[PDB]
Amino acid sequence: QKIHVGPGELDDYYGFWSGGHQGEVRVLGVPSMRELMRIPVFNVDSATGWGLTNESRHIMGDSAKFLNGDCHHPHISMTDGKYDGKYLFINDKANSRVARIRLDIMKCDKMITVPNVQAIHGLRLQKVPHTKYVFANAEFIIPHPNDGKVFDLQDENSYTMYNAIDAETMEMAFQVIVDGNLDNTDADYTGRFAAATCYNSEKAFDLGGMMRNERDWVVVFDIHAVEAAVKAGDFITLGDSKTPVLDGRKKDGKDSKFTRYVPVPKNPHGCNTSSDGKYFIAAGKLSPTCSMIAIDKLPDLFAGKLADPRDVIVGEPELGLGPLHTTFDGRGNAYTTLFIDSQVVKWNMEEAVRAYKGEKVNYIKQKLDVHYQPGHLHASLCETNEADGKWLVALSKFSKDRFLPVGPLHPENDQLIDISGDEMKLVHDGPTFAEPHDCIMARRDQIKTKKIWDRNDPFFAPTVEMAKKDGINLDTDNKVIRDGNKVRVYMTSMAPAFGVQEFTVKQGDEVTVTITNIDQIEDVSDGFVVVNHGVSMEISPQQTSSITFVADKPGLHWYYCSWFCHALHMEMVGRMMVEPAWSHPQ
């Protein structure tokens, strides 16, 4: 297996890294581990204007007021248990959002603030028959309503909820109230079942309180039951949200139609569906184990055919100190991070299952040291029935001395590991900024990107409609529209000339500049910066982009093209002239 990609060779896989609390998504080539692109999501990006442009702020909605995000869990949409390359979804723990990225244009095209919850953490996608739902955990228990009269987490109306978002429309589909809280989640290979770990069955707010119970659980959701209750109108709504809300709590020990609670030690964390569809595997964290839930026993469990919820557990291998996450090679082996022991442990799932039946067998095949304190790990195509067993990335949280010193803040260490054979081999240390938690890999042939925009792309269709109200044809027009104290500049750009090279406004005018890059050539992006006004954005071929700012300073103000485009790139410039307020009314 080639590990080094020389000049002129291409990577074999795409990698999509979460940006952690930096808030973006990063596109890597694997196995070189080089960053090919950054996709802004919850961050404000100076380069492309994401968070400054009207198109990006329209997608972010009211949450455009936040300049931060905290993303952990990127996942690729699936059809019949295989990646289909349409969408990537990712969470925001900081401001309780889910974002969707279109993989053809490599941009965030949709974003939703999940109603009536705090902190979207766990996120994964339905696998079968396709990604109809995005499943997302809200991690923190809050009052309902959270109006400041009740603060107690033990009140009967304090809880968190499991969230399902319609993947295609990016509107809420339903929410399920749960006992305890929610950490990570995954889905089966049928569409009926999803599952989430819980670490706060105690509903506590202190460290000792959250660690009291010897077992918390993984809560299993019967999605067919949930959908059936929605179609029946058997639901409530919270606050001003019309989202159907179903109650998955136990009441006096009697189970809900929608959930079952499988006791699992202890503050369990990762929740990972094996690629053969046989198991939900929960990592025991404070317990030196993983618990293997047999998905084929779940129908009977929900049908009352088992006496004890623990009867769906068919394995609980002892692996080492601080198991956090598990991934799969598609050869029947699982790979789990040990945060405390600072290792990845390779183990055989079927042999673990036989040991749980008392058959003394050594299911542990290898422990590999990693550097240091691994969190997530990801094997290539592990989330699909095509899991290919070639590459493994372990994402470690302390790099210590593995890289040159760079001051008190250190990089993370995302280590590439060859698992194509019986022996795991560490091949590359990848330093990264701001804690990627998880990543996801796709084959080169599973991702198809556009090279030039379609003029009808929904990303800027609202801007096209604004232009139409002004009688503007964006592919041709270079015009300044005046409207009271609003000025709407429309121009084409064809390097090295802006189609409008100067325009005049009154001090205090609200100026919108809309630029349509009518170039037809690949890799010729234009840019637009207004000097000393905090204005910057990208305009790629056939894209329309727009930005709005106040001309608060009298005088002459230069604008220029930022994205290098030409040998005469230094000279693609223009001038905004701002007449002083004292020469105009009031």
Next chain:
Amino acid sequence: KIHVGPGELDDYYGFWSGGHQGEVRVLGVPSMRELMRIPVFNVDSATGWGLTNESRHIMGDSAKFLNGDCHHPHISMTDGKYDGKYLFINDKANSRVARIRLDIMKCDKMITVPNVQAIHGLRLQKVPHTKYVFANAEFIIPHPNDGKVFDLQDENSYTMYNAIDAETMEMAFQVIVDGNLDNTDADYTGRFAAATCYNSERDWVVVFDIHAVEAAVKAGDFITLGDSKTPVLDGRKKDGKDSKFTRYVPVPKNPHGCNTSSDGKYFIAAGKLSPTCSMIAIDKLPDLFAGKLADPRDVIVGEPELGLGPLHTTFDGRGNAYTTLFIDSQVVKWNMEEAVRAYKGEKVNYIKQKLDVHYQPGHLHASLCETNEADGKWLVALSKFSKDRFLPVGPLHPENDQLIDISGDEMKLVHDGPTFAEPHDCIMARRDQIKTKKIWDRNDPFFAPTVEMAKKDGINLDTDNKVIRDGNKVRVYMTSMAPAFGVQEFTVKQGDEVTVTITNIDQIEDVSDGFVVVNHGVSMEISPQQTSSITFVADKPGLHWYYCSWFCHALHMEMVGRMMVEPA
């Protein structure tokens, strides 16, 4: 030798401009891996730069801008060698210069350059040390720019060359020039600096007699512009008569790069539209300013013909120059002293090799090239169009930063490094030239204004966990020690303005903490022994969780707290 395997360390630091994204990036060389991001003009969700009170204090009023446009990173020097103290960088978008402290890898000072638009070219005094940062303002504007005069040919429409005091990060002086400024460099004595100029067959490089500028400032022979106290000197020609501060050397044509050879002999201006570089002999500049030379062209001692679109030049310390050819898409290696002999008319081929790069190179940078220790080992060429060199990633493409081995007689291409938002230029330093702190100093100036605020409240930041009430303002102070915040709950009134100040009292390297207030747009870093603070308004009643964002401990998910907001 280019492979840095697991457990092995890079030999050099690379400091990459963040381009239109606004940050500075620290790379390991030769692996070309990104070790750290240093936020400067961008708002960084991870560390809170642009959100925290410490960062917004450094940014000043320019904290209102969320963008920057970076190009030209340079490291401070003592005796013509990197001293590892500071990195400086430009902001073309909002006309700023920022200083980065290389011991903490943070931006610690920032200035908006008065009465100019767009800081682009930037380089440092070399000798006797980096007393001044020299910065080009690119665009001609009216003076004053108050909306009465828009005419760019007006006698009071011009741009200026800028000198910033490197140590105080206050303006030192400004010099009015004819034309537009492009790039700039400085000599190895401190007397001279030079810049290419591209407005008005032939443009020029303007040479500054900094000694003459300094003498005028000290005698009070200057004006000021607007409400800035910056001394302003007039370096324009007047009725064909020269300033005492400047000489204009004719150089073809729309010249671009302006690079000082590491032997100190030449300012080398890249010809761009002319397939040449022009070599200005620095040892002839005293005679030029003394009126001893018949013609400003007499300081030109070489004009090698190199190829189509020369843009920038760097040096191996062995006597060779390396120049990017933007149109031919190559790096050309040539011998400077042989070029000088050719200019006198000898038949001698000064061109040694042309190496194809991919594609359209702009800046290039050889290791230690800006110092008299230029070591001839590594060369990075930064190319604008990566085309098919990397996997496709949609309509936007990465820059291709290519690593080239120049240690022997033949340049060898060894690595293609894709980068985001057109870094444009970079600088390298030996590992042993950079010395960084493992943990913060409690007296560090970076958070000294916060320590002062704490003092007024009677707070010992190293020990206290206290909530101060002051009208509708609430100032929370706490220590943090993974996995526990020192204040785990507090209660305020709806509408209160809450400041949270956190001191990480861990002493273990790499155990950084974070602080995020859910659904309030609040995020920041607190590394070992740092104090960080952030201010927000509690505009939502109810219970609102806060949590640690930096994975710090097996119990990281559980390092949380509660803010309770009583309805108005």
